[PDB]
Design a protein around this ligand. Structure first.
Ligand SMILES: *[C@@H]1O[C@H](CO)[C@@H](O[C@@H]2O[C@H](CO)[C@@H](O[C@@H]3O[C@H](CO[C@H]4O[C@H](CO)[C@@H](O)[C@H](O[C@H]5O[C@H](CO)[C@@H](O)[C@H](O)[C@@H]5O)[C@@H]4O)[C@@H](O)[C@H](O[C@H]4O[C@H](CO)[C@@H](O)[C@H](O)[C@@H]4O[C@H]4O[C@H](CO)[C@@H](O)[C@H](O)[C@@H]4O)[C@@H]3O)[C@H](O)[C@H]2NC(C)=O)[C@H](O)[C@H]1NC(C)=O
Ligand SMILES: *[C@@H]1O[C@H](CO)[C@@H](O[C@@H]2O[C@H](CO)[C@@H](O[C@@H]3O[C@H](CO)[C@@H](O)[C@H](O)[C@@H]3O)[C@H](O)[C@H]2NC(C)=O)[C@H](O)[C@H]1NC(C)=O
Ligand SMILES: *[C@@H]1O[C@H](CO)[C@@H](O[C@@H]2O[C@H](CO)[C@@H](O[C@@H]3O[C@H](CO)[C@@H](O)[C@H](O)[C@@H]3O)[C@H](O)[C@H]2NC(C)=O)[C@H](O)[C@H]1NC(C)=O
Ligand SMILES: *[C@@H]1O[C@H](CO)[C@@H](O[C@@H]2O[C@H](CO)[C@@H](O)[C@H](O)[C@H]2NC(C)=O)[C@H](O)[C@H]1NC(C)=O
Ligand SMILES: *[C@@H]1O[C@H](CO)[C@@H](O[C@@H]2O[C@H](CO)[C@@H](O)[C@H](O)[C@H]2NC(C)=O)[C@H](O)[C@H]1NC(C)=O
Ligand SMILES: *[C@@H]1O[C@H](CO)[C@@H](O[C@@H]2O[C@H](CO)[C@@H](O)[C@H](O)[C@H]2NC(C)=O)[C@H](O)[C@H]1NC(C)=O
Ligand SMILES: *[C@@H]1O[C@H](CO)[C@@H](O[C@@H]2O[C@H](CO)[C@@H](O)[C@H](O)[C@H]2NC(C)=O)[C@H](O)[C@H]1NC(C)=O
Ligand SMILES: *[C@@H]1O[C@H](CO)[C@@H](O[C@@H]2O[C@H](CO)[C@@H](O)[C@H](O)[C@H]2NC(C)=O)[C@H](O)[C@H]1NC(C)=O
Ligand SMILES: *[C@@H]1O[C@H](CO)[C@@H](O)[C@H](O)[C@H]1NC(C)=O
Ligand SMILES: *[C@@H]1O[C@H](CO)[C@@H](O)[C@H](O)[C@H]1NC(C)=O
Ligand SMILES: *[C@@H]1O[C@H](CO)[C@@H](O)[C@H](O)[C@H]1NC(C)=O
Ligand SMILES: *[C@@H]1O[C@H](CO)[C@@H](O)[C@H](O)[C@H]1NC(C)=O
Ligand SMILES: *[C@@H]1O[C@H](CO)[C@@H](O)[C@H](O)[C@H]1NC(C)=O
Ligand SMILES: *[C@@H]1O[C@H](CO)[C@@H](O)[C@H](O)[C@H]1NC(C)=O
Ligand SMILES: *[C@@H]1O[C@H](CO)[C@@H](O)[C@H](O)[C@H]1NC(C)=O
Ligand SMILES: *[C@@H]1O[C@H](CO)[C@@H](O)[C@H](O)[C@H]1NC(C)=O
Ligand SMILES: *[C@@H]1O[C@H](CO)[C@@H](O)[C@H](O)[C@H]1NC(C)=O
Ligand SMILES: *[C@@H]1O[C@H](CO)[C@@H](O)[C@H](O)[C@H]1NC(C)=O
Ligand SMILES: *[C@@H]1O[C@H](CO)[C@@H](O)[C@H](O)[C@H]1NC(C)=O
Ligand SMILES: *[C@@H]1O[C@H](CO)[C@@H](O)[C@H](O)[C@H]1NC(C)=O
Ligand SMILES: *[C@@H]1O[C@H](CO)[C@@H](O)[C@H](O)[C@H]1NC(C)=O
Ligand SMILES: *[C@@H]1O[C@H](CO)[C@@H](O)[C@H](O)[C@H]1NC(C)=O
Ligand SMILES: *[C@@H]1O[C@H](CO)[C@@H](O)[C@H](O)[C@H]1NC(C)=O
Ligand SMILES: *[C@@H]1O[C@H](CO)[C@@H](O)[C@H](O)[C@H]1NC(C)=O
Ligand SMILES: *[C@@H]1O[C@H](CO)[C@@H](O)[C@H](O)[C@H]1NC(C)=O
Ligand SMILES: *[C@@H]1O[C@H](CO)[C@@H](O)[C@H](O)[C@H]1NC(C)=O
Lengths: 442, 124, 124, 124, 47, 48
């Protein structure tokens, strides 16, 4: 009885850290949910501690690859728009106008082949300022992105609204889920649970703000890795959502043309009504109260009395220095310089925001390609929720009382770290070894 | 009542040994490559440990027993302070360096020592 | 003589039980995806029922026996009027609603009740 | 000491029978198709002979024993002149024509003759 | 060939709801246009 | 020497050496190169 022997045990609840692939779960067309498997059933655990660690997850690395592949292949069978890079004879549209919007809205004219390759065709059209560039009476413009990349047109029937998806794990694995209320980035979590696959994830694309996202618990939370270090980013999350309204009020017509056999090309028509400028509103009082709440949470790392000041952006391209998103099919770039104004010491109307529109886009920074976006007939409206901001700080000398904050971000990976923080992939190993007093027969 | 999948993950080894089968029954439950690179990857992970448990002479059972001495130089605990208080997750640490040694001499010795015997006994 | 594959499909259960192995031996016998989406799909269909039959304590045999009472509330027939006249295809209907019940309590009870015993017997 | 993989390939059958497990343990150890057309092809080659060895009544063991007479008309050698001098590679030749006969009557007869008996014994 | 004859067993067949016709109807048209992928594209003829 | 059948002149003959003898090969011109843009985004190099 004292001389212990060894036994094995099959099916023992023990796990290890390892990372493998995932797949869909989801229930005309969108970019994503063409053909993958349709879809709760969680299981509670207790008094099991586990060291979670976001910013080092491998679930964020996999999906970031799986978006750009999903984006690209849903653009391949559409029309290759190579013969459009011609010389444009072009002038200003809507002259003698005294409003703000003057330097936009140029009216151009070019040639284009028809279905008969021996006949040609004349056409009139319009373009915004940020996509034409003069080359060295009217002047001679060309497109913004023709000397580097072959540009393509998206198919006009497919659309770009987000559809909630689930990431789901194959057999032989599991997904852990911390169910704590207050939880910073890295630390143990005393309340875990096993879920087969997760809740809905909206893959919204945005910079400098977070739209349509999930809320938090009763107190707003700041999150980073090492706040002392000024190099990393800062994730904040709200509890009460603040609304914004955005529109684009002018009326538009679209027209059609046939560049070759079977292919089709859409373009912008004219303006019926009033030349206006697209803008965004926000309720003034609740935004101020939200900033006053988030600075109270921020003071827990910098003593009681240090001067906190907000400021505008620093530089870079248009992607980051302004606020950008997609409302319903046409792409925005809003200035948002009016939301990071005056400082803070210890002792009914709304805010408007100017916002410009660009057509030719290179998202995801890849050289060689760029896409077109056809115009939308009719006026456009969007409402949304703002849940969470992206802040970074600056340096400074040793003797300092003013510590600044500028809304940065830009790197698209943090748009999913705000949502996929409470999960961790894990692998079951069902074979274990332990001793007892047993001894087999002969 | 069945707690569910991984229900006894924080409980005592002696209590977790009461329920083992629920952890076993859930084990085998251009874009088509991803639905086959994962579907194939489940299989030999099952088949490796199935074959390893087969070669240890007790493929059919679950609570296998063998005659190999424990040799408390590996770890030195009593019978009570293993099967009453800690869980399997704490048990994984002190064993994690002896695994290839234990997997070896269990396998290479015993079933080779066994099959000599019924070859000689059924001879007579 | 062997009738062939599915030869006894219309015969008596008592006659079909004489020949079982011939049904078992034939079980595992861009366009390349279709020759692998089918080839993989045969495998876990074999492996699922292999693993299910393994957990019922009698993986090796074919005519397994267990101690679970029949409880004739499920179906009420005698010994003679099952094993003499009808075939398995008629037998599939009256059992088709009790299957998850039968698969449960056979599995969750008996092999868990078994493995308590040799753990205690080989202790002494 | 373990010679390694295929170490006893030139040695005596009686010496090669001492070490069998090392040959078994290494058995399961656009361009992605080639890394799956080969990975799948290992599996059923394992699974075919696993299932064939299962149906012969002795899936668990390695040195199986059955009651089928040898009938020396197939080959006529000494117990000594088999297990002392030649190797398995020479043994493969004289058996290579009787294989389907041996695989048949071992399989179709014996386990069918066995399962009649415990059906009748456990009846009483 | 190598058919196997049966006896005494009946089955309720149902054509016009068969699922074998749905699969092969797709397997023609996928195999049809695949044979025209490497051939010559006759775009400059619409004159 | 290695072949298939020395009596038949149809096949080839493979010989293999032991001490490798060296060989030097070079081309001594200088050759500046130039570039041109053929279409949208594409590129073509040629000889200068
Ligand atoms: C954060 O979340 C919020 C959640 O609300 C998001 O806000 C919503 O975002 C969606 C994005 O799709 C917006 O939808 C768009 O709404 C347009 C306006 O439609 C409304 O008014 C019309 C007026 O008649 C009503 O008929 C509509 O009612 C429809 O739905 C109700 C459901 O109750 C039905 O009962 C009705 O019968 C209607 O079916 C709306 O109330 C809408 O026009 C637009 O849809 C066009 O575009 C799609 C894609 O092309 C077409 O499928 C659709 O048929 C419409 O087609 C236009 O374009 C085609 C192109 O060929 C033309 O041929 C047509 O003539 C037409 O011009 C779209 O559905 C929604 O308004 C918005 N707000 C709310 C409050 O829901 C935020 O976006 C999100 N933030 C993000 C993503 O950043
Ligand atoms: C974030 O980065 C900070 C900045 O370096 C890190 O905190 C630092 O951690 C080290 C631990 O090795 C501390 O070093 C120790 O310092 C004491 C004297 O203060 C010395 O006696 C010890 O022997 C040891 O060297 C260091 O002081 C500490 N820095 C500060 C400002 O406290 C840390 O690694 C990062 N993570 C956090 C804070 O979570
Ligand atoms: C290479 O090619 C030569 C072609 O000559 C092959 O040699 C020939 O092999 C045959 C065997 O079938 C010899 O035939 C025999 O010849 C003797 C003497 O004539 C005769 O008594 C036998 O009854 C039989 O006919 C043939 O003579 C021989 N030729 C020569 C010139 O020796 C050789 O086998 C080939 N080798 C390989 C590796 O392919
Ligand atoms: C971990 O959780 C288990 C189950 O929830 C707790 O189990 C209790 O164990 C004590 C014995 O120490 C019993 O008296 C209780 O009745 C058990 N609770 C039940 C069955 O609900 C256990 O307390 C927890 N671990 C620790 C260290 O407290
Ligand atoms: C369309 O292409 C023509 C071809 O050169 C361009 O204009 C021609 O210019 C010559 C000489 O000035 C005139 O004789 C022709 O009558 C012009 N033809 C046309 C169709 O304009 C012209 O630049 C191109 N048109 C546009 C709008 O880009
Ligand atoms: C592609 O074309 C654009 C626009 O013509 C070029 O960008 C301009 O290049 C000139 C070169 O002297 C600069 O002076 C301008 O400041 C550039 N415009 C900017 C930065 O908005 C671009 O260089 C061209 N790329 C090539 C030829 O590779
Ligand atoms: C967003 O709005 C601000 C507010 O006017 C703009 O900032 C101006 O930038 C010019 C740059 O030469 C300065 O001369 C002005 O003094 C700034 N305005 C004020 C009130 O100080 C800014 O240009 C706008 N656009 C962007 C992209 O930030
Ligand atoms: C097919 O059905 C027939 C009649 O329905 C079955 O009848 C058997 O016929 C043979 C030949 O005369 C007799 O030896 C058996 O005793 C009959 N059995 C019974 C139950 O009457 C027959 O079993 C069925 N199967 C086959 C393979 O013929
Ligand atoms: C997170 O919170 C725990 C508990 O207060 C603390 O030990 C840890 O240092 C915190 N980490 C960060 C990055 O704030
Ligand atoms: C926009 O233009 C269309 C074109 O007919 C017209 O019917 C419509 O009334 C205009 N205004 C709005 C708000 O859609
Ligand atoms: C924004 O639009 C919504 C749409 O329902 C409206 O209720 C609200 O009054 C508007 N203004 C603000 C400041 O939210
Ligand atoms: C913002 O809110 C605070 C409430 O704490 C109020 O005192 C202040 O007047 C508001 N406006 C500005 C511009 O700070
Ligand atoms: C800041 O002031 C608050 C006042 O409620 C006090 O509770 C807290 O301890 C102070 N924190 C620091 C870091 O001085
Ligand atoms: C902040 O608001 C004041 C109000 O007069 C304005 O003058 C100033 O330009 C604003 N600064 C920024 C950075 O928005
Ligand atoms: C914004 O949040 C509120 C809070 O529940 C919700 O009612 C509203 O629908 C949200 N807006 C969305 C999801 O567009
Ligand atoms: C058992 O433990 C002792 C302790 O030092 C060690 O020397 C020995 O190698 C181990 N193994 C055997 C088989 O005795
Ligand atoms: C537990 O193990 C210790 C050695 O670590 C031993 O002295 C003691 O007798 C054991 N039993 C108990 C505490 O019941
Ligand atoms: C296991 O081996 C590693 C290898 O360095 C060592 O660091 C660790 O302390 C060992 N743990 C035990 C429990 O022996
Ligand atoms: C057996 O059948 C009876 C008939 O009503 C039923 O009540 C009972 O639940 C069944 N099962 C057992 C285990 O007795
Ligand atoms: C067959 O079953 C019935 C009940 O349905 C029973 O009464 C009879 O004794 C059984 N045996 C026969 C007919 O030999
Ligand atoms: C089995 O259950 C179904 C479910 O409605 C029922 O229709 C059928 O009659 C049942 N059959 C038997 C034999 O119990
Ligand atoms: C032995 O083989 C012979 C020749 O094939 C055959 O006639 C005979 O039936 C066999 N006897 C046994 C016992 O297998
Ligand atoms: C071996 O077999 C031969 C015949 O093959 C027989 O003469 C001899 O007695 C048997 N035993 C020996 C000598 O190996
Ligand atoms: C096996 O059969 C082949 C078939 O022709 C024959 O050539 C060979 O000699 C046979 N070998 C033995 C050992 O029976
Ligand atoms: C290769 O060498 C062997 C050994 O000398 C000889 O028997 C054979 O004929 C040779 N074959 C050729 C093709 O040279
Ligand atoms: C070739 O031309 C380059 C051009 O500057 C010059 O630097 C170089 O010296 C020339 N000769 C050689 C041998 O490279």
């Amino acid at each position: 009885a004292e001389n212990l022997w060894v036994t094995v045990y099959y099916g023992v609840p023990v796990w290890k850290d390892a990372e493998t692939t995932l797949f869909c779960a989801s229930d005309h067309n969108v970019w994503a949910t063409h053909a993958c498997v349709p879809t709760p059933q969680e299981i509670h655990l207790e008094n099991v501690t586990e060291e979670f660690n976001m910013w080092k997850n491998n679930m964020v690395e996999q999906m970031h690859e799986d978006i750009i592949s999903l984006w690209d292949q849903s653009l391949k069978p559409c029309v290759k728009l190579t013969p459009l890079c011609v010389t444009l004879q072009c002038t200003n549209y809507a002259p003698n106008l005294l409003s703000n919007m003057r330097g936009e809205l140029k009216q151009c004219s070019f040639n284009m082949t028809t279905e008969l390759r021996d006949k040609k065709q004349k056409v009139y059209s319009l373009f915004y300022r940020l996509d034409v560039v003069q080359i060295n009476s009217n002047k001679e413009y060309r497109l913004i992105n023709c000397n580097t990349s072959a540009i393509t047109q998206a198919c006009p029937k497919v659309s770009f609204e987000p559809i909630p998806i689930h990431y789901c794990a194959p057999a032989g694995f599991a997904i852990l889920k911390c169910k704590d209320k207050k939880f910073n980035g890295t630390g143990p979590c005393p309340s875990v649970s096993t879920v087969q696959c997760t809740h809905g994830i909206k893959p919204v694309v945005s910079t400098q703000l977070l739209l349509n996202g999930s809320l938090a618990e009763e107190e707003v939370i700041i999150r980073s890795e090492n706040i002392t270090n000024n190099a990393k980013n800062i994730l904040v999350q709200l509890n009460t959502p603040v609304q914004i309204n955005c529109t684009r009020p002018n009326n538009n017509t679209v027209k059609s043309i046939r560049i070759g056999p079977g292919q089709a090309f859409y373009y912008f028509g004219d303006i019926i009504g009033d030349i206006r400028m697209a803008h965004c509103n926000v309720s003034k009082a609740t935004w101020n109260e939200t900033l006053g709440k988030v600075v109270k949470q921020l003071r827990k790392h910098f003593g009681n009395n240090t001067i906190i000041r907000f400021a505008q952006s620093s530089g870079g391209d248009l992607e980051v220095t302004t606020h950008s998103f997609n409302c319903g099919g046409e792409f925005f770039y809003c200035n948002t310089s009016g939301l990071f104004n005056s400082t803070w010491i210890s002792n009914n109307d709304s805010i408007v925001l100017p916002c410009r529109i660009k057509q030719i886009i290179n998202m995801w920074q890849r050289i060689g390609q760029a896409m077109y976006a056809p115009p939308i007939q009719g006026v456009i409206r969007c409402v949304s929720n703002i849940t969470g901001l992206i802040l970074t700080r600056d340096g400074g000398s040793t003797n300092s009382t003013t510590e600044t904050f500028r809304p940065g971000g830009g790197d698209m990976r943090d748009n999913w770290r705000s949502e996929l923080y409470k999960y961790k992939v894990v692998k079951i190993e069902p074979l274990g070894v332990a001793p007892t007093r047993c001894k087999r027969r002969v | 009542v069945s707690l569910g999948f991984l229900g006894a993950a924080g409980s005592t080894m002696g209590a977790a040994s009461m329920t083992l089968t629920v952890q076993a029954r859930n084990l085998l439950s251009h874009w088509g490559i991803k639905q086959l690179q994962a579907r194939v990857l489940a299989v030999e992970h099952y088949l490796r440990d199935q074959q390893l448990l087969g070669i240890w002479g007790c493929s059919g059972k679950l609570i296998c027993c063998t005659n190999v001495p424990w040799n408390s130089s590996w770890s030195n605990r009593n019978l009570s302070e293993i099967w009453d208080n800690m869980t399997w997750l704490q048990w994984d640490k002190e064993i994690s360096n002896y695994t290839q040694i234990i997997y070896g001499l269990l396998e290479e010795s015993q079933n080779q020592q066994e099959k000599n015997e019924q070859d000689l006994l059924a001879l007579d």
